[PDB]
Structure formats: C-alpha cells, structure tokens
C-alpha cells in the first residue's frame, strides 16, 4: 500500500534462492524507512549495492585430464574450445586461472588432479589454496574415483561447497542410460562410505542439456546472497531460463538503485535530458547487451557462423539501433517515446504520485529489450542445426 511496503513488496515475486538481497536486510531497510531514518535507509541500500558490485567469485574445477574440465570452464565462460582464451585440456604442474571474458569478477581455476601429484588430500588442498575458492566442481567423465571422494571429504571438512559433475553423457550412445550412469556413480560413493550425494550429468554436444539447468540453479542458490548477482550475469545465455533469470536479477538491481537515488513526485516525461544521464544510459545499454551476448562482437561472430553481413543480424533485433544516429529522430525523442511506452504497459510501478527518476524507467525498458533480443537470436540459433 504505502511506499515502505512497495519497496519490499517488489521482491515478493522472488523466492529465497532468487533474491539478490536478503529478507533480513530488506526488513531492516523497511524499518528505517518507517522510522524516518532518512539517511540510514539510504546507506543500508548503498552498502548493499556496493557489496553486490564488488563481489568476486573463484571457482575451483578438478578431476582428470581430458574428462571435461577444460570444456566445462570454457562453456561457462562463453568461449569456444579452439577460440582465443579457451582453457586448454590437461596441460599438469599447478593451478591455472581463467577469467570470464565479460565479468572480471568471475574466475575459474583449473586444478591439477590429486592423482597427478604426490600430495595427500589435506596438503593437496593447502597447495592448491582451497581457502580462496567459493565452491568446488569435481568432474568425472566416468563414475568418479576414490580420489574424487577423498577430495570431497576434505572439502566438506573445511566447510566448503563441492558439486559432483558427470560430463560426456552425450557420448553414451533405452534412452534412460542416465539412470544407469547415475547408478554407477552411486555405487562408487556407497563403496567409499558416503551417503547418496547429488550428481549433475552433463552433455558436450548439447551443453545446455540434462542437469545443466538445475546445476545452474543450485550454484546460485547455495552461494552467499550478495555473490549471486555477479555470477548469474556471467552464465552462458544458452537457455531462455538462464536468460529470463538474469533479467529478474537485473530488475532487482535497478529497483534498489532507483530507490537509493531518491524517488520523485513528478511524472517521468523526458522534456530535457542531461548529457550526464545520457552517457549513463549508454553505459547501461552496453552492460546489458554484453551480459546477454547481443553486443557488437557477439553479433559479428553470429554473422559469420551463418553468413550475411552483420547488417542483417542486427536487423533481427531492436537494441542495436537505440543509439544509432538518424537525421529523422533525436535521441531525446526516441528515449522520450520509450518512457511513455514503458509506463503505458507497466505503469509507474509505485503508488500514486511517486516515481523513480526517468533513467531507471529507461534501464527497465532497455533490459526488457535486450532480454527479448537474446531470446530471439537463441531461438534462431536453435531453429537451425
């Protein structure tokens, strides 16, 4: 009903595992809004966004050589295996990092298998600097080994998160050969004195297949709340679910940002646009396009994979022309029209006589645009092949 209730109510749509901020903090912020603590409410939101933005993620990936490690690391980074920057199989002396191409805050580490070293579990983890990782990805293309489990045991002893990933299920060429593959893994765990652990089976030809979806959900879910945003944004845009999930996260961030900047009591209508906010809007559009893989480069490659000049790929979507020069229409007119379109379909998102400043409604419009663009190209990429 009131503003304090509208602020926290916006997050009712998202379950515990999809919030980019905790209910505890949301409840705290609301209290401060209701207390009139007109400064502590802004600092709470401020520090919350700051903590979200500066979050760094380090993912340790271990297993055996030629069992998927490299492909896993590369598909999560959105890089082709023989592409530049592509993590290369096996190699192995010691730990090797691979930063995400777009989100510097995310780093995957190729760790040498403990089998290719003469280090016992705990000492191996100390050598590999276990304390630096947010979670571990234990990969096996078969049914895991004693090594894989001793490592897990050591990881759980230190309170860290690990996940069992069975790659190359696709090479297993009825249909439910998955339950068999899963049966072999379970016996291994049972054989090693461990209760039934979850397992995620993955495919290489069709990477976004099988347990990829739920694995993606688990990693974000188990992650500390403030770390989810930066990792979510880094995931590969290979399913409408990941894509739609990213939008949900970015929408939450815009909301927080809109409130921090202070609400206003005048309808949006962009009659004058500071060069200041224009550049901000240009940066937002560049951030969203990259995140959703619809930025210039991504479109160029896409154009090659098919043929035709980029010209026609861009023509398939809408975000590429937002800031493209035209003698027929000014940016002011274009953006001024977007605000009206948005608020006409979505309303002002707040109780009567209260509004977010103009830029925020524009960020929401762009985000929707890019999200739709990504789903359009994905649908085309899938339609083929």
**CATH, residue 179:** 3.40.50.300
92 and 115 in contact (C-beta within 8 Å)?
A: no
Judge if 201 and 339 occupy the same domain. no
Q: In what order do the strands lie in the sheet with 106-110?
A: 96-99, 106-110, 57-62, 135-140, 161-166, 199-201
Judge if 10 and 95 occupy the same domain. no
Specify the 3-state DSSP secondary structure of 318.
coil
Judge if 209 and 270 occupy the same domain. no
Widest distance between CA atoms in the chain: 72
Domain final residue, candidates 178, 193, 223: 223
Domain final residue, candidates 207, 223, 239: 223
The position carrying tokens 């409410």 is 41
Judge if 230 and 273 occupy the same domain. yes
293 is in an annotated binding site: no
Specify the 3-state DSSP secondary structure of 98.
strand
Judge if 50 and 72 occupy the same domain. no
| Phi then psi dihedrals of residue 215, to 5 deg | -65, -45
Identify how the structure was determined: X-ray
Tell me the two tokens of residue 305: 């994979």
Q: How far apart are CA 48 and CA 52, in angstroms?
A: 6
Q: How far apart are CA 286 and CA 319, in angstroms?
A: 10
Judge if 377 and 236 occupy the same domain. yes
Judge if 201 and 107 occupy the same domain. yes
Q: With left for phi above 0 and alpha for psi between -120 and 50, is residue 307 left, alpha or beta?
A: left
Judge if 246 and 354 occupy the same domain. yes
- Cβ of 353: how many Cβ atoms within 10 Å? 11
Q: How far apart are CA 99 and CA 73, in angstroms?
A: 10
Cα separation of the two ends of the chain: 50
89 is in an annotated binding site: yes
Q: How far apart are CA 46 and CA 36, in angstroms?
A: 17
Name, in order, each residue with C-beta under 8 angstroms of 333's C-beta and a sequence gap of 6 or more.
none
Q: How far apart are CA 52 and CA 256, in angstroms?
A: 11
Judge if 191 and 84 occupy the same domain. yes
Tell me the two tokens of residue 341: 């379109």
71 is in an annotated binding site: yes
What are the E-state strand segments in the chain?
57-62, 96-99, 106-110, 135-140, 161-166, 199-201
Judge if 31 and 116 occupy the same domain. no
90 is in an annotated binding site: yes
H helix runs in 54-93, sequence order = 69-77
Concatenated DSSP letters for 339-355? HHHHHHHH--SSSTT-B
Look at residues 177, 183, 180, 124 and name the one whose alpha carbon lies nearest to residue 150: 124
How many structural domains compose the chain? 2
204 is in an annotated binding site: yes
69 is in an annotated binding site: yes
Domain final residue, candidates 173, 191, 223: 223
310 and 299 in contact (C-beta within 8 Å)?
A: yes
Judge if 23 and 70 occupy the same domain. no
66 is in an annotated binding site: yes
Q: How far apart are CA 168 and CA 344, in angstroms?
A: 48
Judge if 218 and 246 occupy the same domain. no
Specify the 3-state DSSP secondary structure of 198.
coil
36 is in an annotated binding site: no
Which residue segment(s) compose the domain that 239 sits in?
A: 1-55+224-385
């Amino acid at each position: 009903n009131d503003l304090p209730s509208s602020f926290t109510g916006y997050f009712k749509k998202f379950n515990t595992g999809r919030k980019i901020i905790s209910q505890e903090i949301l409840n705290l912020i609301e209290l401060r809004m209701r207390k009139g603590n007109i400064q502590l409410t802004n600092s709470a939101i401020s520090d919350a966004l700051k903590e979200i933005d500066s979050s760094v993620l380090n993912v340790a990936v271990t297993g055996e050589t030629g069992s998927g490690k490299s492909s896993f690391i590369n598909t999560l980074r959105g890089i082709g295996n023989e592409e530049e920057g592509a993590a290369k199989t096996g190699v192995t002396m010691e730990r090797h990092p691979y930063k995400h191409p777009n989100i510097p805050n995310v780093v995957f580490w190729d760790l040498p298998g403990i089998g290719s070293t003469n280090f016992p579990p705990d000492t191996y983890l100390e050598k590999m600097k276990f304390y630096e990782y947010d979670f571990f990805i234990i990969i096996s293309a078969t049914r895991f080994k004693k090594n894989d489990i001793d490592i897990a045991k050591a990881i759980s002893m230190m309170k860290k998160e690990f996940y069992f990933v069975r790659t190359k299920v696709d090479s297993d060429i009825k249909e439910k050969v998955l339950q068999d593959i899963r049966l072999n893994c379970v016996n291994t765990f049972r054989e090693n004195g461990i209760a039934e652990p979850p397992i995620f089976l993955l495919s290489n030809k069709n990477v976004c297949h099988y347990d990829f979806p739920v694995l993606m959900d688990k990693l974000i879910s188990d992650l500390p709340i403030y770390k989810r945003h930066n990792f979510m944004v880094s995931l590969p845009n290979i399913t409408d679910s990941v894509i739609e999930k990213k939008r949900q996260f970015l929408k939450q961030r815009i909301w927080l940002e809109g409130f921090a900047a202070d609400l206003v009591n005048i309808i949006p209508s962009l009659t004058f646009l500071l060069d200041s906010d224009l550049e901000t809007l240009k940066k937002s559009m560049k951030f969203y396009r990259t995140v959703f893989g619809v930025d210039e480069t991504s479109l160029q490659r896409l154009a090659r994979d098919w043929e035709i000049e980029v010209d026609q790929v861009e023509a398939m979507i809408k975000s590429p022309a937002v800031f493209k020069p035209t003698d027929e229409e000014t940016i002011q007119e274009r953006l001024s029209r977007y605000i009206q379109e948005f608020c006409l379909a979505n309303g002002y998102l707040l109780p009567k006589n209260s509004f977010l400043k103009e830029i925020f409604y524009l960020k929401y419009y762009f985000l929707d645009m890019v999200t739709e663009d990504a789903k359009t190209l994905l649908k085309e990429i899938c339609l083929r092949n």
